[PDB]
Write an enzyme that holds these catalytic residues in place. Structure first.
Site, PDB file in Angstrom:
ATOM      1  CB  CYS B 106      38.605  41.366  32.184  1.00 26.08           C
ATOM      2  SG  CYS B 106      37.400  40.750  31.128  1.00 26.08           S
ATOM      3  NE  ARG B 109      38.156  40.382  36.383  1.00 23.21           N
ATOM      4  CZ  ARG B 109      38.818  40.852  37.565  1.00 23.21           C
ATOM      5  NH1 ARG B 109      39.555  39.970  37.995  1.00 23.21           N
ATOM      6  NH2 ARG B 109      38.775  42.284  37.528  1.00 23.21           N
ATOM      7  CD1 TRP B 278      29.289  40.455  25.610  1.00 22.33           C
ATOM      8  CD2 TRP B 278      29.217  38.414  25.599  1.00 22.33           C
ATOM      9  NE1 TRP B 278      28.969  40.019  26.750  1.00 22.33           N
ATOM     10  CE2 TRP B 278      29.026  38.773  26.882  1.00 22.33           C
ATOM     11  CE3 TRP B 278      29.431  36.767  25.041  1.00 22.33           C
ATOM     12  CZ2 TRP B 278      28.841  37.725  27.911  1.00 22.33           C
ATOM     13  CZ3 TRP B 278      29.099  35.907  26.389  1.00 22.33           C
ATOM     14  CH2 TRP B 278      28.762  36.401  27.563  1.00 22.33           C
ATOM     15  CD  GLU B 283      37.693  48.988  23.738  1.00 22.43           C
ATOM     16  OE1 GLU B 283      37.745  49.255  25.150  1.00 22.43           O
ATOM     17  OE2 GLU B 283      38.280  49.417  23.065  1.00 22.43           O
TER      18      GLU B 283
HETATM   19  C1  HEM Z   1      32.281  37.965  27.439  1.00 20.14           C
HETATM   20  C2  HEM Z   1      32.372  39.633  27.216  1.00 20.14           C
HETATM   21  C3  HEM Z   1      33.599  40.225  28.033  1.00 20.14           C
HETATM   22  C4  HEM Z   1      33.341  41.340  27.988  1.00 20.14           C
HETATM   23  C5  HEM Z   1      32.245  42.300  27.770  1.00 20.14           C
HETATM   24  C6  HEM Z   1      34.779  41.961  28.476  1.00 20.14           C
HETATM   25  C7  HEM Z   1      35.077  43.327  28.689  1.00 20.14           C
HETATM   26  C8  HEM Z   1      36.366  43.771  28.634  1.00 20.14           C
HETATM   27  C9  HEM Z   1      36.900  45.189  28.793  1.00 20.14           C
HETATM   28  C10 HEM Z   1      35.985  46.412  28.670  1.00 20.14           C
HETATM   29  C11 HEM Z   1      37.960  45.237  28.852  1.00 20.14           C
HETATM   30  C12 HEM Z   1      38.995  46.668  28.651  1.00 20.14           C
HETATM   31  C13 HEM Z   1      38.963  46.758  27.068  1.00 20.14           C
HETATM   32  C14 HEM Z   1      40.003  47.709  26.551  1.00 20.14           C
HETATM   33  O1  HEM Z   1      39.849  48.870  27.158  1.00 20.14           O
HETATM   34  O2  HEM Z   1      40.916  47.336  25.827  1.00 20.14           O
HETATM   35  C15 HEM Z   1      38.591  43.925  28.754  1.00 20.14           C
HETATM   36  C16 HEM Z   1      39.884  43.676  28.987  1.00 20.14           C
HETATM   37  C17 HEM Z   1      40.277  42.239  29.046  1.00 20.14           C
HETATM   38  N1  HEM Z   1      39.596  40.988  28.934  1.00 20.14           N
HETATM   39 FE1  HEM Z   1      37.783  40.966  29.115  1.00 20.14          FE
HETATM   40  N2  HEM Z   1      35.573  40.867  28.553  1.00 20.14           N
HETATM   41  C18 HEM Z   1      34.839  39.869  28.030  1.00 20.14           C
HETATM   42  C19 HEM Z   1      35.458  38.254  28.014  1.00 20.14           C
HETATM   43  C20 HEM Z   1      36.879  38.156  27.772  1.00 20.14           C
HETATM   44  C21 HEM Z   1      37.564  36.740  27.703  1.00 20.14           C
HETATM   45  C22 HEM Z   1      36.727  35.571  27.232  1.00 20.14           C
HETATM   46  C23 HEM Z   1      38.895  36.898  28.141  1.00 20.14           C
HETATM   47  C24 HEM Z   1      39.660  35.803  28.546  1.00 20.14           C
HETATM   48  C25 HEM Z   1      39.316  34.623  28.196  1.00 20.14           C
HETATM   49  C26 HEM Z   1      39.030  38.322  28.549  1.00 20.14           C
HETATM   50  C27 HEM Z   1      40.304  38.921  29.041  1.00 20.14           C
HETATM   51  C28 HEM Z   1      40.454  40.100  29.027  1.00 20.14           C
HETATM   52  C29 HEM Z   1      41.825  40.664  29.368  1.00 20.14           C
HETATM   53  C30 HEM Z   1      43.278  39.977  29.489  1.00 20.14           C
HETATM   54  C31 HEM Z   1      41.868  41.915  29.232  1.00 20.14           C
HETATM   55  C32 HEM Z   1      42.888  43.029  29.518  1.00 20.14           C
HETATM   56  C33 HEM Z   1      43.631  42.965  28.219  1.00 20.14           C
HETATM   57  C34 HEM Z   1      44.569  44.332  27.822  1.00 20.14           C
HETATM   58  O3  HEM Z   1      45.419  44.475  28.922  1.00 20.14           O
HETATM   59  O4  HEM Z   1      44.345  44.795  26.953  1.00 20.14           O
HETATM   60  N3  HEM Z   1      37.651  39.034  28.478  1.00 20.14           N
HETATM   61  N4  HEM Z   1      37.491  43.034  28.761  1.00 20.14           N
HETATM   62  O1  LIG Z   2      34.508  44.448  25.188  1.00 13.78           O
HETATM   63  N1  LIG Z   2      35.496  44.641  25.264  1.00 13.78           N
HETATM   64  O2  LIG Z   2      35.782  46.251  24.959  1.00 13.78           O
HETATM   65  C1  LIG Z   2      36.537  44.146  25.077  1.00 13.78           C
HETATM   66  C2  LIG Z   2      37.782  44.624  24.744  1.00 13.78           C
HETATM   67  C3  LIG Z   2      38.952  43.891  24.429  1.00 13.78           C
HETATM   68  C4  LIG Z   2      38.859  42.513  24.780  1.00 13.78           C
HETATM   69  C5  LIG Z   2      37.530  41.859  24.815  1.00 13.78           C
HETATM   70  C6  LIG Z   2      36.928  40.470  24.772  1.00 13.78           C
HETATM   71 BR1  LIG Z   2      38.022  39.033  24.501  1.00 13.78          BR
HETATM   72  N2  LIG Z   2      35.686  40.683  25.071  1.00 13.78           N
HETATM   73  N3  LIG Z   2      35.202  41.734  25.037  1.00 13.78           N
HETATM   74  C7  LIG Z   2      36.307  42.619  24.781  1.00 13.78           C
END
Ligand code: HEM
Ligand SMILES: O=[N+]([O-])c1cccc2c(Br)n[nH]c12
Ligand code: HEM
Ligand SMILES: C[C@H](O)[C@H](O)[C@H]1CNc2nc(N)[nH]c(=O)c2N1
Ligand SMILES: C[C@H](O)[C@H](O)[C@H]1CNc2nc(N)[nH]c(=O)c2N1
Ligand SMILES: O=[N+]([O-])c1cccc2c(Br)n[nH]c12
Ligand SMILES: [Zn+2]
Lengths: 410, 407
Positions: B106, B109, B278, B283
């Site tokens: 992610c 974070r 968000w 993405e």
């Molecule tokens: C607040 C805005 C957030 C942004 C902009 C963000 C953005 C991202 C991005 C760009 C990825 C890769 C997405 C993909 O290619 O599928 C990702 C993956 C991930 N995020 Fe975040 N994230 C946020 C919030 C969260 C929250 C609230 C959680 C958990 C409490 C979280 C947990 C994860 C996890 C576990 C992954 C990896 C999931 C996977 O392996 O498919 N994210 N996030």
């Molecule tokens: O922003 N993203 O590209 C993105 C991808 C997959 C999961 C999440 C979450 Br939960 N917040 N943003 C995400």
């Protein structure tokens, strides 16, 4: 054992058996992955086994494993090593090794070409001047008036490490960088330290923006010497844009021949400290890295200002936009001047093809995803959706300390 | 031991000491790097619990105290009796916030602590789950001013009473295979869109149809529900300079809510833990809209820009991509829905790293996933060396429910 690799865009899966032969470390444990880390005097006892596996592979490739030529060679080598400590490779072996060092380069996306490499045997060279002549012929043959050809020049292998042959430049052709007392930088910041060593050794720098650096060549462990590459041998392309007529006024241009020269070539235990090697550019290395890295010519702001882009807020993607045009221009300029070059879509598609063929060919293709995927538009290239296994195979190209941090001056 | 990480754009070197506390394996070996591979009992449960409780108390400056020791025994005995245990509210909140904190993939974070945790542990039915999910979707959407959130349904017991949310995301578009052989809508969900059909959902066979929630409670059969349309905030995608864009007829949702993952806290496994935050522009713009296997809109978008699609060297795909991602960020902002671009998101992450290294001794980061799928080397996170390793609490993948359920 068998390891599976999947492409998440074609569901095509492949099996890797080749990784079984990988011996060296990768820097990764079962608990930690250093996949994104940049850089994670051999005794007689160490040498033979290495020589053995190499000659075993060589002979296997020519379908003469276990033969008489095969065994006599092993006996010949073993003996030579015992009496002379080291051992010389036959021409066919040098040629075989060089191609395989390239073939095993996990960070190289242009490996479909590995087989077509021109190997120049420079092992009889004894002086810096000798090296200059050798390099000049490499540049001339390889360039070929714009129709580039792959090639590598192999200088004398290391003996006691006190008599190393080294090419001090990182690439045979490269622009100078000069730090101004005002803190800014003129030219290519990436070459500032080297540009210094050159001036401190006698180079009279034109102090311009695209000054082709002089070669600093070190022979048999002696102090390095300066030489100016014949200008008519350094092919260069001025960069203009197909539709942006103000582009030409940016004053940009780049050289056509990319030839790394600071790596070490290991073949059957033998180490070749000086082995300059060239191929041909992929647009993005010039268009996105050399021109746009913040620590390079950093031309985004000026290409954006003239494109009249909303540089107020990044969410306008003025940087992404400028980058594409700049890359549009590098490619267009090369094509117009009939100088070989490949774009990231072509190079990556070809690599996937080469990769697959290599699995059904030798049971694997070590690849470094971090370096294979282009520095732009990553996901719209096929390599992005490709799973890859990274492991070390020999022969190989390795990094080595910069020569100035170790050399004992006379 | 002691590993260092260098940024080759700023030369900054940070030292990582956090990896020493690594538990699960990465899939790699000294012989082979698997960096780019997408996915490599009472006696077991108590040690895991102790480790967690230990961290918790250390985080609240009560390491070793009586409270610490007492609770440690309390849990020990509970596991001895009920073969499992329950987390105090404070531990749950901490567990979830920290699973996010440990998400090596992610990029956002930097927002790890600002997470609203909804305790859905008292839930017993699919309708109950819909009520919980609905409240989750409304709280997080907040009319466009998005807020991070996670709802945690009952933890696993015997594995035959698993609470699960079959959708991969609380909100996604349906995908249908057409007579031709092509695909209508989103190909990534074709299958699930079928299971919803085989279950009764009346598919409107549209380009962007919002799928129904298929909820499973206590190992029972999953039920269908339709999220109140008033609760599904969507954005029509238009371009700030191409008035013909709107005619492409594109729109995406505002709430990214991963729901097919399993949350592990102190040995306990919460198989239904939908969480949302968000979107980062790319993405949707590059992955959802341009990925070959997704909406694959590049060919049409190019056309409309009237550009030479004859030769790849024209970088027309690149050309289109940029404009398509301009339109996404553009629309979201104009409708005042939260969204972050790859440039700000990554810059934010770097800072987050600088804080995590001094305030925690490191930050597990997966380069392959952190680097945006467009303009990679122009985002700071590209030159940032990273160290990947697994830490608990954590979010983990888990098998699709239809591939393992006993109807
Ligand atoms: C607040 C805005 C957030 C942004 C902009 C963000 C953005 C991202 C991005 C760009 C990825 C890769 C997405 C993909 O290619 O599928 C990702 C993956 C991930 N995020 Fe975040 N994230 C946020 C919030 C969260 C929250 C609230 C959680 C958990 C409490 C979280 C947990 C994860 C996890 C576990 C992954 C990896 C999931 C996977 O392996 O498919 N994210 N996030
Ligand atoms: O922003 N993203 O590209 C993105 C991808 C997959 C999961 C999440 C979450 Br939960 N917040 N943003 C995400
Ligand atoms: C035919 C043209 C070739 C193309 C288009 C190609 C393309 C590339 C590119 C784009 C990279 C990554 C460049 C970077 O970001 O620094 C690379 C790396 C590399 N290539 Fe090639 N290559 C070609 C020929 C060669 C040749 C002839 C050899 C060796 C004989 C070779 C050996 C390698 C090695 C060892 C690296 C990694 C260097 C490092 O670790 O920094 N390549 N190549
Ligand atoms: C830190 C990270 O390893 C570094 O930025 C790498 C990433 N991928 C790369 N890929 C290529 N082709 N060239 C590079 O110089 C790099 N730099
Ligand atoms: C094969 C490779 O692991 C795969 O394509 C990964 C690469 N990086 C990614 N990065 C993000 N953020 N999301 C993804 O889905 C992927 N896919
Ligand atoms: O094309 N490239 O971007 C590129 C980068 C680095 C080294 C080489 C060689 Br040798 N051929 N092409 C190269
Ligand atoms: Zn690894």
């Amino acid at each position: 054992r068998f390891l599976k690799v999947k492409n998440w865009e074609t569901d095509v899966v492949l099996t890797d058996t080749l990784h079984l032969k990988s011996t060296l470390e990768t820097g990764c444990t079962e608990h930690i992955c250093m996949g994104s880390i940049m850089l994670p005097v051999r005794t007689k006892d160490q040498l033979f086994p290495l020589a053995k596996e190499f000659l075993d592979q060589y002979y296997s490739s020519i379908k003469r494993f276990g033969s008489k030529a095969h065994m006599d060679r092993l006996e010949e080598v073993n003996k030579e090593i015992e009496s002379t400590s080291t051992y010389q490779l036959k021409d066919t072996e040098l040629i075989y090794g060089a191609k395989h060092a390239w073939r095993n380069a996990s960070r190289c996306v242009g490996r479909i070409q590995w087989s077509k490499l021109q190997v120049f045997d420079a092992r009889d060279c004894t002086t810096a001047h000798g090296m200059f002549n050798y390099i000049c012929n490499h540049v001339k043959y390889a360039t070929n008036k714009g129709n580039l050809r792959s090639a590598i020049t192999i200088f004398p292998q290391r003996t006691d490490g006190k008599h190393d042959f080294r090419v001090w430049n990182s690439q045979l052709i490269r622009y100078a960088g000069y730090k101004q007392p005002d803190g800014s930088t003129l030219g290519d910041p990436a070459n500032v330290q080297f540009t210094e060593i050159c001036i401190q050794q006698g180079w009279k720098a034109p102090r311009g923006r695209f000054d082709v650096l002089p070669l600093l060549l070190q022979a048999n462990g002696n102090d390095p010497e300066l030489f100016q590459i014949p200008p008519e041998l350094v092919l260069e392309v001025p960069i203009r844009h197909p539709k942006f007529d103000w582009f030409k006024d940016l004053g940009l241009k780049w050289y056509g021949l990319p030839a790394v020269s600071n790596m070490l070539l290991e073949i059957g235990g033998l180490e070749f400290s000086a082995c300059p090697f060239s191929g041909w550019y992929m647009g993005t290395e010039i268009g996105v890295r050399d021109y746009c890295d913040n620590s390079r010519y950093n031309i985004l702001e000026e290409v954006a200002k003239k494109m009249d882009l909303d540089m107020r807020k990044t969410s306008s993607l003025w940087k992404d936009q400028a980058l594409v045009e700049i890359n549009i221009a590098v490619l267009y300029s090369f094509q117009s001047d009939k100088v070989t070059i490949v774009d990231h879509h072509s190079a990556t598609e070809s690599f996937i093809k080469h990769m697959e063929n290599e699995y059904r060919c030798r049971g694997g293709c070590p690849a470094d995803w971090v370096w294979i995927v282009p520095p732009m538009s990553g996901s719209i290239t096929p390599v992005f959706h490709q799973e890859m296994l990274n492991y070390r195979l020999t022969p190989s190209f390795e990094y080595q300390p910069d020569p100035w941090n170790t050399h004992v001056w006379k």
